[PDB]
Amino acid sequence: PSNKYLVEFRAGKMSLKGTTVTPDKRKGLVYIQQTDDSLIHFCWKDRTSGNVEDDLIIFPDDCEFKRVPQCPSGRVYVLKFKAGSKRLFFWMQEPKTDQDEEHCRKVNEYLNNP
């Protein structure tokens, strides 16, 4: 028996430089995990290596996870840290869109509820 992710979905990363957001081509996975100290972790894993390469401890009202309407060739989402300039960008990698909005809802619900 092992603790399971609260939500997970396939997604790649993108990087912002200056004003330009450019995709990273790797297959990845966004997930939210509650560790046994009750803390909530927003994570990104490289699906090819299996390496967890982002692991952020998030508290209620730190963040919003929002669709980015400025990109028409993908389903791009941003984890925005409301207090400063920190932003993490992701592009959905599920073949269909029919769970995108539910995944977005669940991310916001788990990050912003105590």
Partner: peptide, 14 residues
């Protein structure tokens, strides 16, 4: 498995 989408094009964020 079903083919995953191609990466999006770069875009402007300000």
């Amino acid at each position: 498995g079903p083919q995953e989408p191609e990466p999006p094009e770069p875009f402007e964020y300000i």
